[PDB]
Amino acid sequence: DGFFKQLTLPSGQVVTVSEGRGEPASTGSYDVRLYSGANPQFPLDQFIDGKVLPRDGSIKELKLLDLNGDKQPELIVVVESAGSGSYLSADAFTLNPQEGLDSFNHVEGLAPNEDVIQALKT
Amino acid sequence: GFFKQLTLPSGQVVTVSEGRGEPASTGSYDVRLYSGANPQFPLDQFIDGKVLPRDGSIKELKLLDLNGDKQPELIVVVESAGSYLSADAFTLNPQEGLDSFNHVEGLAPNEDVIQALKTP
Ligand SMILES: [K+]
Ligand SMILES: [K+]
Ligand code: NA
Ligand code: NA
Ligand code: NA
Numbered sequence A: 001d002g003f004f005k006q007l008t009l010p011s012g013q014v015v016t017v018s019e020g021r022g023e024p025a026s027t028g029s030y031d032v033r034l035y036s037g038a039n040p041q042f043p044l045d046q047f048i049d050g051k052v053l054p055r056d057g058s059i060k061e062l063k064l065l066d067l068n069g070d071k072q073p074e075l076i077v078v079v080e081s082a083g084s085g086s087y088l089s090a091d092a093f094t095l096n097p098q099e100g101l102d103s104f105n106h107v108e109g110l111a112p113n114e115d116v117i118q119a120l121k122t
Numbered sequence B: 001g002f003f004k005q006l007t008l009p010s011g012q013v014v015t016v017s018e019g020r021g022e023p024a025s026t027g028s029y030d031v032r033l034y035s036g037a038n039p040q041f042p043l044d045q046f047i048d049g050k051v052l053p054r055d056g057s058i059k060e061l062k063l064l065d066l067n068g069d070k071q072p073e074l075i076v077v078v079e080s081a082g083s084y085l086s087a088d089a090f091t092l093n094p095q096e097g098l099d100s101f102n103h104v105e106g107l108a109p110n111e112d113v114i115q116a117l118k119t120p
């Protein structure tokens, strides 16, 4: 099994993030799947929506931070290139009970010392 | 959890997966398309993917030309945990990528899913 992480949002919704099965470490895809989380004992029983995105590198971090000021965290998936420069890219998603899952922003080709969060707000 | 890889005669590669950790009876599946440009590395060149709901468990995959352009579409057939079939079809090509072709649902087990997907 490859990369898999499950997070519970403040609303009680549950999100999973996976890299594509059978893919190389250096490049491929990942998906984000949102669930209602209505029963925390069976958090993945009620699927809502999902997206598949390319990754130029490996997932390096998952962050839950409010980017748009609505008080709820967006999900940020930070990806680090296998290149010697370790260039960063990231996708942000809104995920909430009212709207479900949507893309918020995407950045790529960032130097390792760049402010990814500020870039995603830009 | 369902996982299957198919390779088209063009060389394109597709994988179909049920969502990890989900119930057998309900959840999601994803379809991922790769170029397969180097056939020894089928999953080295990702193109595009989609995540869909499944009302049931994946029964089988088919590759068949649904619109008569001589390229195969991908069909994902789903069986309810209860008896009904549903199915989603997708176009796949190097030129365009991955797109929805059609969707059918509430079919009897004996019905022709492929003819249903072809029929306006
Ligand atoms: K949405
Ligand atoms: K497309
Ligand atoms: Na891992
Ligand atoms: Na690339
Ligand atoms: Na927010």
Ligand code: NA
Pocket (backbone or CB within 6 Å): A068, A070, A094, A099
């Ligand atoms: Na929003």
Ligand code: NA
Pocket (backbone or CB within 6 Å): none
């Ligand atoms: Na919508």
Ligand code: NA
Pocket (backbone or CB within 6 Å): A101, A102, A103
């Ligand atoms: Na969207």
Ligand code: NA
Pocket (backbone or CB within 6 Å): B064, B065, B066, B067, B068, B069, B070, B071, B072, B073
């Ligand atoms: Na066709």
